[PDB]
Amino acid sequence: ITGTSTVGVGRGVLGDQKNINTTYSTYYYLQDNTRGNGIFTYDAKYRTTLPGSLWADADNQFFASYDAPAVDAHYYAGVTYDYYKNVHNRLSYDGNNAAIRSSVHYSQGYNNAFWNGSQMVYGDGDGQTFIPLSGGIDVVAHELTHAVTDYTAGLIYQNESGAINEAISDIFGTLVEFYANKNPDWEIGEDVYTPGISGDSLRSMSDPAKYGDPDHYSKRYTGTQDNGGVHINSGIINKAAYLISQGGTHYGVSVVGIGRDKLGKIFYRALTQYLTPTSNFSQLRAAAVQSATDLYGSTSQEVASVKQAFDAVGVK
Template sequence: MLTLLGLGCMIGNFGNLVYAEQTNSGGISLEKDNSMGRIPDFKKGNLTPISDQNPEIVIFDYLNTNKESYQLGSKKAEDSFDITQITKDPVTHFTIVRLQQRYEGVPIWGYTQVAHISEQGVLKVFSGDIAPNLDQFHSLQVTRKIDETKAIEIAQKDLNMQVTYEENPTSMPYIYLQNGKPIPVYMVHLNFLDPEPGNYYYFIDVQNGNIVDKYNTINSTSVTDRKVPMVGTNTMGTGKGIWGDVKSLPITLLENKYYLQDTTRGAMIVTYDAKNRLQVPGIIWSSITNVFNQSYDAAAVDAHYYTGITYDYYKNTFNRNSYNNSGAALYSTVHYGKNYNNAFWNGSRMVYGDGDGHTFTSFSGGLDVVGHELTHAITETTSNLIYRKESGALNEAISDIFGVLIKQYQNRNIDWEPGKDISVSRNQAMRSMSNPTKYGDPDHYSKRYIGANDNGGVHTNSSIINKAAYLLANGGTHYGVTVNGIGTDKMGAIYYRANIAYFTESTNFSQARVRLIQAANDLYGGSSSEVTAVKASFDAVGIQ
């Protein structure tokens, strides 16, 4: 069986799955019940008057005016929130501001917000979970009895594995909410690829050293590739992919060698060879000719070519310049490990295994797989959806959605079955977006997985959102609800906008519904058939 490893990993083994039988209920509301009290998690309208103040002041004035509604206690908003990102919205020309909630200067894990301010200085949207009344909790008034170094030691002991770190372990103070109770913790980050990929987050109680929580994801945000781009001559080459198809490749000629380095897109696209070892980046792929036709070349040819197609899709469709919208270099490593049955994004590069040769072949041989991994990078630099439970399943679904849309962009038939092109038989996929139950995944919220495996079912429950997206694009009747399809282009535009403009780290399925409706409203108008279709698509999968 195949084993799930983390963010960007395409497949997993979930053992004895536990599924829900009940449905969620209740209509869309601007108010949200949480374990710490009822507070708004999405508000829109003219929330503030016209102002010539900068966006930060507009937001802080709004929060200070509405302290009671958000249950912020005695603290000023300026002392409770940090501005983490400011961007310009290409659709509305509003300023989009992302925030991180803090208490006494310490960030609160998973509590981020996003605000939209019009060109007239009016706050139009405020979205995201807020932890209320933190100053009422005596648990925050503690003396730290362990330090950062001890917290790392505790995490390493629990890991119980000899690893080669990709980056030095780190430990940072956070506040972690457990069942509504805030606990001061150290967040320990352990990132490694050998003996197997791991990117662990541990939350260690500062009082007693207990492990409050832990989970594994392949989402390293600080691994960097320090290789200097080769300065040579841009030229073209050709190569054969894993299925023998010939592809044109932008490459670099330097000192009588041809390298898989494309400097015509963003900063550059570079493809590396791990030589079946567990270290990355490996060495830059090269040849003495500009023809890459050897069987060992095939995985690199596909990775290089499909990364370029993925870059082109986002640039030509959304005017997005690489995953960070600032032209970041795109690195791929192929031939990772031996018979490694997976692919993942590790925070700095796409990494592809060769497959076991029985079920799957090289994972870089699927354009939808390459698009899936690079979309994880976009999510990481925008909404940064936490890779657990519903936010993690939403993260996975977004990557599946854009994987198939990128495949369609290259004028291929859209089959709605991620991973089919890397199946040895070419008739078995990892998931089905049109019929999730084909591979044992839920197609309705009432059937969702509620166990602890797979970070709370990120690869299983993603199928519920996948089905909603499929219905939104194609239409159909599901569980007695009829959806009028709006086509793949509009579906993609709505999901892209929601991810970059409205989703926050902890967005769950119900919140995603509200934010996708708002994205459709922005693009097509509040009374449009597109907004109606978004609502119906979520009705059809039982998400209210």
């Protein structure tokens, strides 16, 4: 809608207070005009028709329980917008400031979130396995990053290309988390996962095997489940990215870490300039080596570490 740009206040899923960019026209809407062609959040009202209703509030204050997922989907979309623009000089997910839209309160007890080709969708969780998934900034940035992949490399959501797709979403999810720098880690979804159990996570990049995911190519899954294991074999690439950033010795292979920022520069370049819809793990290593080479030179530590990292996950 057309309206006056305002700033509201409320708290998130985790009970934290934050300010949000709203739009005033009789009601206050969760529409942020300060980033690109807008960030828009909607109420799916526990149903599954999308996107639902543009979120409207009478007084611009968002402290109801019902408000919380909305507040966070809105806010972390903006943080995710800010990462791509400031860090990668990318304007929204399509690179031309496309409107970002999210729907929350999707279905009943929906233990998931996703990108559906046009927008982000977040369930509320069943309150046991999950709380409203928008509470995790790594979850939000994972979702939007799927959007980024779909407009760039277009990695098909199956087999190795699919695991690459997922891994990219986990890698940038994580980088954005470190970027907002609120308790960041190399784990996935911990803020909104299993409310009753501290310390766990949906997935781990540092040690994917923690949750039954492979950290070596020889342990790769090749059944037909989970689209040929896009959420399973992603661990092999996640581990690799973890290693490039952080370093370590994995199955006897030592990797010199080069930190988060260069990891992000190297994978963003691979994603946008080298990867394609059918790239496999092998092509990804080549893409990453070329990227690192592009960025730091053929004889750099960066190229070397990239190689070490894929070597360690058994990817040639």
